[PDB]
Design a protein around this ligand. Structure first.
Ligand SMILES: Nc1nc2c(ncn2[C@@H]2O[C@H](COP(=O)(O)OP(=O)(O)OP(=O)(O)O)[C@@H](O)[C@H]2O)c(=O)[nH]1
Ligand SMILES: Nc1nc2c(ncn2[C@@H]2O[C@H](COP(=O)(O)OP(=O)(O)OP(=O)(O)O)[C@@H](O)[C@H]2O)c(=O)[nH]1
Ligand SMILES: Nc1nc2c(ncn2[C@@H]2O[C@H](COP(=O)(O)OP(=O)(O)O)[C@@H](O)[C@H]2O)c(=O)[nH]1
Ligand SMILES: [Mg+2]
Ligand SMILES: [Mg+2]
Lengths: 430, 430, 71, 430
């Protein structure tokens, strides 16, 4: 009687949704056709006899990815008319997907959301995935969040956004729409998790020893993180954690809800079994700055609160004996007004392996969600990138001619300045 | 009633105890499984002296084993009769002292000793009527000579009226196995005189000499030296565990053998000792026992007893024999050797008879004599100490752990004062 | 400045500030410039070069941080 | 619960590490694959099920030797990512491996050291091996020792350095970096053992009767010495010795810790069994000047302290009877302020033989570690070699251009002069 609905918008969102939906189907024993040859209820729904239907909706204005989905092996799984598709792409223009073509599509998506919500009885909250540096992704994510915040109100929404890397970039105009989308979801999303690609590339290179990774390898790690986060809702555990038990433990103030994640262990089968993978060493590896899932240095800032999930055969006393060691270290310092900052969850189900993938099978794993003061650097560098081109009003004509006003750029800049001032104000000791 | 507890420290003390308890168990007919299988009624009447009673009818020694490294106690457990010791009494550290007296007495030995003192207090508070404690340790090692002597002071501070025994092995200059022996020997002798009620010196050189000359066995090992020391140890308390013509507990020996409170360093010897091939030739008679008892080569110390005069002497005969013969022989051994007995104290030999002989022997004698000839050992120890200290050799190891040279100077001065005032009575005349 | 001082004081056990360095040599080359290189196990400082004379005066404050050997 | 970590840096270090790691695996019954078909814990760690992983790390900037290791029969034994390798060699330049390329590699080595140390609970100390007359070996050894001395502090580190021969040399510039590395490890290493190649060549020629030896024959003898030194930690013995029990017995003063070793017997199976190999004759052979493992004459100087290890069926009384004979001889004289200078250890496990090797199987062996005043000759001759080329500033441009200052050469010369003066000051009688 506990449910959650995941929203996938944009090319990156759909490509990570595919990645998480192989993993969930594999973890619950459901074949790609949707047929089994009481834990499924969190992500799926029973049709009365036979197949299961995911509680997910796919959105995009550009039809190529959806058409690829509707012809692959998973054509029989998803309901045919929840893969909403458009005709014309926003083409990396934020104003297009927020004012011009997204408005005519958003009504169908909201109707689908209502039709899925009326089925659930114990709706925990929503999940949303969107790559921020694109037109349709950021614009439609903003519009959907704004509609949901007023249609439903206090229901919790979680956002797994992928911000651009510090120096590596695929587009040339992504700072503009990244800043605008951050403006939009700052006052509209309860949790936002950092996911830039460069850090995960470094993780793959160093640990998985892959020298030529593709997007699928990144999306599989993200899917594993999602599964670790939501395992506690569908498996028995000695110390459970619910989604609604987050803003009471990780969010000191309503404005501050951007945090960065990490995962451990990450290791290949060729050298995994030569070492014992004790809980102490994995919880040490999870706190290593080089294993952050976002390219930010935690040594440059304080910690505010750490929520970290275990799964497997871990015993609570071993967890406490390792939290003490971390509190001992002099290179990790917490904020003054937080004496204890750890929330611990323990689950029994070990992580599942996907055949043909990178990760091996292990009995212990740890996933941490940590809120730290050091996150302000990404905001500062994105702001610096934005200012350089906004000084000469470059690329603005592509946005003014799509219905957006001239002054809309300035207030996003002011909100980022306010956020950066707030992060500095919080981190000073009393 | 009037029972004593056993406390041992260091590797040498643990190896001595590993044979002492085997000898005691064989004497009382206790199997290595703790089950009594004896033949005589007297074997159980006074078993409360050394053994406790537990459920299931088995017996457990009241011994406490301590060391700064776990190897020796992990090895003694696998030996014969190793299961008798209660696992709770095993206390050990993880670092060791490295034959450094300062580490085993100031830095490491101070923090650990609380746990062993807890179990020592548990053992002493419980027992019916305390008689006292007996201590086995070596003066040639760091952890032993430090922790044991500090424990002596701690025990004396809490039980000032009980009696205290120490069986101390001092490093001889002939067979030297450690270069830093003089330092921790001199430091230990300083503390040992202030607190120990009785002290019995034992030398490895004298044990090798005895094994080579009297027993005439080809290849001595530590097992033979331990067996001789164990027989000598058992001989002292025999009449406290068995009936006899003249019972004499440890306190009675303390009264009769210590003229002045600072002169309590005895040297001992055991008789009879015969080779395997000559055990059929000899006939066991009181004259044969007493002629070997006062033999100079039979002493457990290299000190030559005809280089000085006995202040007093004691003998603990075992077996059933006539008292008239014992008294007349004691008188004869004192009339024919009047030059080696001090003249201002007449009748300075104490005798006792116990009717229960050792298993396998019909008569046995334990000799404990307080003589002025013991000065030679302290003389040579101090000579080596002052030869090494004048150049401050190896001094930095001790001075790096809070100790200073002033405590070395005071120890040397007190030891020399002891040497002088011990011989002061040798030249005293009436 | 307080955070930099705190990081320095966390890494090092002491500081020596050297000032007013006067060099005297038995023979100077009149056409040569001289500088002082002040070094320990943790780093080195250099003075500005000065022209050779019977006594040279190097101005500057040289903070030398230690973690063990005070040479 | 007692552990030790061995560090191998440079070509000579790796080639002697291979030599010691066949011997340890053979001695503990572990197959080259790492699988057995409680004494292993000193050098190895259990992975939970099956294989054992050595507590060793291999370092080198030049990849050839590591690549040879990773393809031999021992490819499965070592953990794949503790064989740290560089790309560019230091090329016999000390300044390169201390200032230019070693700094970028040292962080990974320190991370590996931390990851290995957190596993150990009773860490006794570190072992390090490095051939001194090379760039990467000396430079990285110096840098690692300097980092470890501050990261861990009082933990003991032992250095088995191989100094160049008096006249035989492979390079032309090795005195410079030898002097600099001696400067670096003089104030940073607790024990340094002399290992020059010429003496071991003479040993092989005279005893093993090999006229064409290679480096493997030398490394096997060094491995046997290491095994004899560390046997007491992992086998039962009548007289044990720990690593921490050295600076209290062999190191009179903090500056003086360079000592030279010897081993006996060294004999081939073709003529070993014709003679009885008594303990007296082996302990006489060990003290022969021609059997020193470093090309120095002990007859030219006094002894300070001798620590010498036995293993096999040796009896302590036979050891004492042989120490007395050595004290008797007039050609061996000890320093005045040291009356006794011998520390003796006895172990029961006989030395193990490596198949296809040179040494035969024997029941008794002796290994001595002796600190003597005669060691100053090697320092004097190295100093004389250094001065000849430093007079004209030859080869200095290869060092100044790698970031090192001009004055760094002089202070090493001053420290060697100080050491030579100290050795003369200590050896004079009072
Ligand atoms: N992690 C991850 N990021 C992706 C992936 N695909 C695209 N991105 C990121 O998405 C950003 C651009 O947005 P996209 O998702 O590609 O395109 P969009 O969101 O659909 O917006 P449009 O361009 O209007 O179609 C790029 O900067 C990429 O970094 C992916 O498969 N994995
Ligand atoms: N005993 C012994 N000494 C060796 C061995 N190999 C090299 N050496 C000595 O090491 C010295 C030079 O240092 P190397 O170890 O060969 O080279 P390195 O330490 O890696 O330094 P680089 O030249 O920069 O690579 C030579 O003078 C040799 O005497 C060996 O296998 N056994
Ligand atoms: N009788 C006897 N003496 C021993 C034995 N083992 C060691 N010793 C003596 O103890 C001395 C060394 O003491 P040590 O082991 O360092 O004591 P520790 O420092 O407390 O461990 C040596 O001189 C030996 O003569 C043994 O089994 N029996
Ligand atoms: Mg697209
Ligand atoms: Mg090389």
């Amino acid at each position: 009687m506990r449910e959650v609905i995941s929203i996938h918008v944009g090319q990156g969102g759909i490509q990570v949704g595919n990645a998480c939906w192989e993993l969930f189907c594999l973890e619950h024993g459901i074949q790609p056709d949707g047929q089994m040859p009481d834990a499924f209820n969190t992500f799926f729904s029973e049709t009365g006899a036979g197949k299961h239907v995911p509680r997910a909706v796919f959105l995009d204005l550009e039809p190529t990815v959806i058409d690829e989905v509707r012809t692959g092996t998973y054509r029989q799984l998803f309901h045919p008319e929840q893969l909403i598709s458009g005709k014309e792409d926003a083409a990396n223009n934020f104003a297009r997907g927020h004012y011009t073509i997204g408005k005519e599509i958003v009504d169908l998506c909201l109707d689908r959301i209502r039709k899925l919500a009326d089925n659930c009885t114990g709706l925990q909250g929503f999940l949303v995935f969107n790559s921020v540096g694109g037109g349709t992704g950021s614009g439609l994510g903003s519009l959907l969040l704004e509609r949901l915040s007023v249609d439903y109100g206090k229901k919790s929404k979680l956002g797994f956004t992928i911000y651009p890397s510090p120096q590596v970039s695929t587009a040339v105009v992504e700072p503009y729409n990244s800043i605008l989308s951050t403006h939009s979801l700052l006052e509209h999303t309860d949790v936002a998790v950092m996911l830039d690609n460069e850090a995960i590339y470094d993780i793959c290179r160093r640990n998985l020893d892959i020298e030529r990774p593709t997007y699928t390898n990144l999306n599989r790690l993200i899917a594993q993180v999602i599964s670790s986060l939501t395992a506690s809702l569908r498996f028995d555990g000695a110390l459970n954690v619910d989604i609604t038990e987050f803003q009471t433990n990780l969010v000191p103030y309503p404005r501050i809800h951007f945090m960065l994640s990490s995962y451990a262990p990450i290791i290949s089968a060729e050298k995994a079994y030569h070492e014992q993978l004790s809980v102490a060493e994995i919880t040490n590896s999870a706190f290593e700055p080089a294993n952050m899932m976002a390219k930010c240095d935690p040594r440059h800032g304080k910690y505010m609160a750490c929520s970290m999930m275990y799964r497997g055969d871990v015993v609570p006393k071993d967890v406490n004996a390792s939290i003490a060691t971390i509190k001992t270290k002099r290179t990790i310092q917490f904020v003054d007004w937080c004496p204890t900052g750890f929330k611990v969850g323990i689950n029994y189900q070990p992580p599942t392996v996907v055949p043909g993938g990178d990760l091996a099978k292990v009995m212990r794993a740890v996933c941490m969600i940590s809120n730290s003061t050091a996150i302000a650097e990404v905001f500062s560098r994105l702001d610096h990138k934005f200012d350089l081109m906004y000084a000469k009003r470059a690329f603005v004509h592509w946005y003014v001619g799509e219905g957006m006003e001239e002054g809309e750029f300035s207030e996003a800049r002011e909100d980022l300045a306010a956020l950066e001032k707030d992060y500095e104000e919080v981190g000073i000791e009393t | 009633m009037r029972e004593i507890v056993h406390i041992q420290g260091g590797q040498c003390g643990n190896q001595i105890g590993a044979k002492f308890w085997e000898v005691i168990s064989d004497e009382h007919g206790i199997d290595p499984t703790g089950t009594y299988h004896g033949d005589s009624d007297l074997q159980l009447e006074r078993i409360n002296v050394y053994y406790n009673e537990a459920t299931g009818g088995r017996y457990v020694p009241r011994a406490i084993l301590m060391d700064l490294e776990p190897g020796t106690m992990d090895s003694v457990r696998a030996g014969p009769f190793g299961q008798l010791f209660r696992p709770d009494n095993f206390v050990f550290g993880q670092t060791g002292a490295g034959n450094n007296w300062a580490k085993g007495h100031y830095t490491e030995g101070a923090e650990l000793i609380d746990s062993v003192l807890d179990v020592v207090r548990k053992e002493a508070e419980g027992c019916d009527c305390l008689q006292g404690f007996q201590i086995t340790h070596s003066l040639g090692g760091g952890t032993g000579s430090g922790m044991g002597t500090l424990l002596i002071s701690k025990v004396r501070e809490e039980y000032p009226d009980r009696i205290m025994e120490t069986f101390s092995v001092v490093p001889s200059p002939k067979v030297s196995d450690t270069v830093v022996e003089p330092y921790n020997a001199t430091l230990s002798v300083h503390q040992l005189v202030e607190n120990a009620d009785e002290c019995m010196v034992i030398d490895n050189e004298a044990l090798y000499d005895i094994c080579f000359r009297t027993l005439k066995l080809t290849t001595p090992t530590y097992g033979d030296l331990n067996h001789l020391v164990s027989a000598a140890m058992s001989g002292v308390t025999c009449c406290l565990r068995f009936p006899g013509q003249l019972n004499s507990d440890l306190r009675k020996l303390a009264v009769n053998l210590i003229p002045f409170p600072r002169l309590h360093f005895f040297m001992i010897g055991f008789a009879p000792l015969t080779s395997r091939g000559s055990q059929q030739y000899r006939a066991l008679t009181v004259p044969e026992l007493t002629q070997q008892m006062f033999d100079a080569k039979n002493m457990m110390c290299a000190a030559d007893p005809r280089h000085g005069r006995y202040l007093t002497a004691s003998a603990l005969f075992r077996g059933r024999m006539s008292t008239k013969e014992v008294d007349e022989q004691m008188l004869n051994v004192q009339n024919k050797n009047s030059s080696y007995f001090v003249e201002w104290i007449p009748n300075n030999i104490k005798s006792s008879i116990c009717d229960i002989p050792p298993k396998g022997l019909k008569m046995a004698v334990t000799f404990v004599g307080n003589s002025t000839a013991i000065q030679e050992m302290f003389k040579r120890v101090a000579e080596q100490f002052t030869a090494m200290f004048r150049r401050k050799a190896f001094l930095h190891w001790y001075t790096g752990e809070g100790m200073d040279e002033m405590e070395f100077t005071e120890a040397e001065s007190n030891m020399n004062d002891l040497v002088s005032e011990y011989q002061q009575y040798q030249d005293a005349t009436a | 400045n307080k955070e930099q001082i705190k990081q320095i004081k966390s890494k090092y056990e002491s500081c020596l500030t050297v000032t007013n360095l006067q060099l005297s040599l038995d023979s100077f080359k009149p056409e040569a410039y001289y500088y002082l290189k002040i070094r320990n196990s943790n780093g080195s400082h250099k003075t500005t070069p000065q022209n050779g004379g019977a006594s040279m005066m190097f101005q500057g404050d040289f903070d030398i941080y230690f973690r063990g050997q005070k040479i």
